[PDB]
């Protein structure tokens, strides 16, 4: 009998592919998302700014009527 170490029954395949799935989407979608979220933030910032303008005018009314 012989007791070397051959490949017992053959070994299966071994990959060597450059498998890069390319996660993400196209860049035009990235520009669309960026400009959309940016403009969303601009509109919300505009609304909050003019609300605080209203309250700032009310504080001006306080300092005007409080003075004499």
């Amino acid at each position: 009998v012989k007791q070397d170490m051959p490949p017992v029954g053959g070994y299966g395949p071994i990959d060597y592919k450059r498998n890069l799935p390319r996660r993400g989407l196209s860049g035009y979608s990235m520009f669309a998302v960026g400009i959309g979220a940016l403009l969303f933030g601009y509109w919300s910032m505009m609304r909050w700014n003019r609300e605080r303008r209203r309250l700032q005018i009310e504080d001006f009314e306080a300092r005007i009527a409080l003075m004499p």
Partner: protein
């Protein structure tokens, strides 16, 4: 028999050049590298606790 690298050209389709320019302006594959490194962050570390777990050897 040979298999040599880096023989192409950057494309002239507007979609391909704006995808490459989006990679340039938008730090994209840098963030993908961060994602790969965090994927190795959430593994369990293969350190052996030395004076209690000694290393493997041969006969």
């Amino acid at each position: 028999t040979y298999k040599y690298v880096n023989l192409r050209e950057p494309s002239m389709d507007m979609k391909s050049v704006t995808d490459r320019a989006a990679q340039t302006l938008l730090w994209t594959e840098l963030i993908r590298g961060l994602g790969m490194t965090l994927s190795y962050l959430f593994r369990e570390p293969a350190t052996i606790n030395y004076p209690f777990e000694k290393g493997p050897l041969s006969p």
